[PDB]
Design a protein around this ligand. Structure first.
Ligand SMILES: [K+]
Ligand SMILES: [K+]
Ligand SMILES: [K+]
Ligand SMILES: [K+]
Lengths: 132, 130
């Protein structure tokens, strides 16, 4: 069983992703948040296997949260509306294992979580096509 | 509590698939189709005639707003989804019954569909910002 914390400011996606991931037999959403501070606080206290975060959030950003959680054993998957090529390097240095676009199929999300748990790095193909 | 057929038109595929999954769990609802453009919504609604169409106001090709205006005299009840004024008035004139923000709780969505089906106007309380 994979324990997942989800930090997303847009409540409709937060609740919809939480419902989606909970239907998986090997996944459990153990907590939900709306700010980067919520992610830092939960991860440091509860130590989930995976943290799914929006790159942009009020208070502390998903990126600032990722950097603060760099030395925890938690696997960070970043969600972004835009490819944000200029912010991707900061995410790599932060130790982000997954970097996904909100235009990616929802089916690939559970697969990304499982891949990241198997020590693989999952990046949006659009970001390679954008960066190169 | 007759079954409600829903079509979802959303360009961000992760929200499209996640919303489709969430609404399908409801006993009185069925997601009969999914689309990524405004033309997909116009084409689906005109051919398959769903009870409700959930649309993102901004989409590639034809927008959710242009689609809503084209589908004004159909029978289909439009609920608009938006991330972010003049676009709200254009929706009311187009006959849009529902106007929700992506920052609204996902639980408001099923309830909105049911309310719109009962002839009510649903505008997200979150919309009244400042
Ligand atoms: K589960
Ligand atoms: K975003
Ligand atoms: K159903
Ligand atoms: K939008």
């Amino acid at each position: 069983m994979i324990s997942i914390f989800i930090a997303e400011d847009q409540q409709m996606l937060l609740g919809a992703l939480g419902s989606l991931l909970n239907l998986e037999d090997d996944m459990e959403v153990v907590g939900k948040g709306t700010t980067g501070q919520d992610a830092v606080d939960f991860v440091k206290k509860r130590q989930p296997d995976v943290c799914i975060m929006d790159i942009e959030m009020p208070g502390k950003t998903g990126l600032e949260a990722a950097e603060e959680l760099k030395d925890t054993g938690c696997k960070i998957i970043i969600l972004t509306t835009f490819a944000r090529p200029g912010y991707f390097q900061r995410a790599i240095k932060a130790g982000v294992k997954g970097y996904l676009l909100k235009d990616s199929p929802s089916e690939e999300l559970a697969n990304a979580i499982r891949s990241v748990m198997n020590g693989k790095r999952i990046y949006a193909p659009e970001l390679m096509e954008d960066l190169y």
